[PDB]
Design a protein around this ligand. Structure first.
Ligand SMILES: *[C@@H]1O[C@H](CO)[C@@H](O[C@@H]2O[C@H](CO)[C@@H](O[C@H]3O[C@H](CO[C@@H]4O[C@H](CO)[C@@H](O)[C@H](O)[C@@H]4O)[C@@H](O[C@@H]4O[C@H](CO)[C@@H](O)[C@H](O)[C@@H]4O)[C@H](O)[C@@H]3O)[C@H](O)[C@H]2NC(C)=O)[C@H](O)[C@H]1NC(C)=O
Ligand SMILES: *[C@@H]1O[C@H](CO)[C@@H](O[C@@H]2O[C@H](CO)[C@@H](O[C@H]3O[C@H](CO)[C@@H](O[C@@H]4O[C@H](CO)[C@@H](O)[C@H](O)[C@@H]4O)[C@H](O)[C@@H]3O)[C@H](O)[C@H]2NC(C)=O)[C@H](O)[C@H]1NC(C)=O
Ligand SMILES: *[C@@H]1O[C@H](CO)[C@@H](O[C@@H]2O[C@H](CO)[C@@H](O)[C@H](O)[C@H]2NC(C)=O)[C@H](O)[C@H]1NC(C)=O
Ligand code: GAL
Ligand code: FE
Ligand code: ZN
Ligand code: ZN
Length: 341
């Protein structure tokens, strides 16, 4: 039992982490970086111990010796008697969403359209869609496929950032942190919802959580589920209730990574941390709730029921699975063995 230093990405995540720290008796403390990458670096140097990551980043981190410790687990149906922490992870559905009123827009007519991505290097927002788009066009010119986009993490003055609005003053345009108005799952969908983009690459859960009154946020309160449509790969369009038969791919859950020599200790603290601030935690909602950030998915996704033991002590490759790891490899060829820092 020593402290665990968590790496928060951006001002909002550090605010939430500072609250978590205060409520934990400093059992968990914070470190901040303007970027997920920078946070990986801080963990490599040994200045931060852990952070929760999307599959695309687990891959970057894995190449540098970091290892998945616990995964986020959301609501399911299979394995009912099994507890959340021991229950296998279901994965999540990556989808391409559009406005219904945008008739005639299919997967086959996305060229020169306007796209909203969660952030460069992420699973549903970048890796899967651009992976499919490169293969389909047999070209690495993925910077020239759309006319304009908001793909946080790309060059601020390039087309991939043309649609990003930055912040509130307009500063930090395109930064890969929750301060890019259109950063992440929620931001990319808002990008679509406000008709800035024609399509948004998010996950199925995002569409549901921000429509039909589920979100009390200004831009989303009047959002209706039936005004959106998913783009399947066979060229058709289906209602967002058909996600199960109209997705680009099934993605591995976001997971908490840490240096291999610190993993056991990070795991220990965290389990006890959710016993306190998790879904049924002793001090949530009374004092602090670890998985609630208010439709903002800070540190963790708001739909996390709990952090689950992986098991079978995964290396990063088998946690991400073999078909996904090859998909990233091939995409990375465009822009084999080496840590990127
Ligand atoms: C863009 O294009 C890229 C290139 O076309 C795509 O990458 C290709 O992805 C394919 C699918 O992931 C790979 O093909 C593999 O197919 C075989 C079958 O998979 C096996 O399935 C069994 C379950 O029955 C499992 O045991 C295991 O998952 C297997 O991989 C593979 O043959 C197998 O070899 C293993 C050896 O361990 C063996 O266990 C099995 O018996 C079986 O013989 C085969 O080896 C392939 O891995 C392609 O490799 C891959 N292409 C390249 C260049 O490597 C990419 O997906 C596309 N991007 C997107 C986003 O779609
Ligand atoms: C796309 O993403 C959305 C949002 O993540 C998924 O929809 C959610 O799925 C949950 C489980 O599959 C739904 O159930 C929740 O809410 C109900 C409230 O009534 C709770 O009770 C359940 O009731 C059903 C029906 O009787 C029972 O079978 C269950 O056992 C359970 O008792 C339950 O506790 C659970 O939290 C939820 O309604 C829904 N969320 C929203 C806001 O719509 C959707 O499944 C997913 N689609 C695909 C294809 O993955
Ligand atoms: C901070 O960390 C430790 C985790 O072990 C907690 O302090 C322990 O509390 C447990 C449960 O009451 C005792 O069994 C241990 O003996 C304590 N360890 C010692 C000697 O310090 C503490 O609960 C954590 N704080 C919070 C709020 O999670
Ligand atoms: O982490 C272990 C996992 O490895 C994956 O490759 C596989 O798809 C899963 O079935 C599970 O065994
Ligand atoms: Fe993701
Ligand atoms: Zn599928
Ligand atoms: Zn293994």
């Amino acid at each position: 039992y020593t402290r665990v230093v968590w790496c928060a990405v951006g001002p909002e995540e550090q605010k939430k982490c500072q609250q978590w720290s205060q409520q934990s008796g400093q059992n968990v403390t914070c470190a901040t970086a303007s970027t997920t990458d920078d946070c990986i670096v801080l963990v490599l140097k040994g200045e931060a111990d852990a952070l929760n990551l999307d599959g695309g980043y687990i891959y970057t981190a894995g190449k540098c010796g970091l290892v998945p410790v616990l995964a986020e687990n959301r609501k399911s149906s299979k394995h009912s008697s099994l507890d959340c922490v021991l229950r296998p992870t279901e994965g999540y559905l990556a989808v391409a969403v559009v406005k219904k009123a945008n008739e005639g827009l299919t997967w086959n007519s996305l060229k020169d359209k306007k796209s909203c991505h969660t952030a460069v290097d992420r699973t549903a927002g970048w890796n899967i869609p651009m992976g499919l788009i490169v293969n389909q066009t047999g070209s690495c010119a993925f910077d020239e496929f759309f006319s304009q986009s908001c793909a946080p993490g790309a060059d601020p003055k390039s087309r991939l950032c043309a649609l990003c609005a930055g912040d509130d003053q307009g500063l930090d345009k395109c930064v890969p942190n929750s301060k890019e108005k259109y950063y992440g799952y929620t931001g990319a969908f808002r990008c679509l919802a406000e008709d800035v983009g024609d399509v948004a690459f998010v996950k199925n859960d995002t569409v549901w959580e921000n429509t039909n009154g589920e979100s009390t946020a200004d831009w989303a309160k009047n959002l209706k589920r039936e005004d959106f449509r998913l783009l399947c790969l066979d060229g058709t369009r289906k209602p967002v209730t058909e996600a199960q038969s109209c997705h680009l791919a099934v993605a591995p859950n976001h997971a908490v990574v840490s240096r291999s020599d610190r993993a056991a200790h990070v795991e220990q603290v965290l389990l006890h941390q959710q016993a306190l601030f998790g879904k049924n935690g002793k001090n949530c909602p009374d004092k602090f709730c670890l998985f609630k950030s208010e439709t903002k998915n800070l540190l963790f996704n708001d739909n996390t029921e709990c952090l689950a033991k992986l098991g079978g002590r995964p290396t990063y490759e088998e946690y991400l699975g073999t078909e996904y790891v090859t998909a990233i490899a091939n995409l990375k060829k465009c822009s084999l063995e080496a840590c990127a820092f």
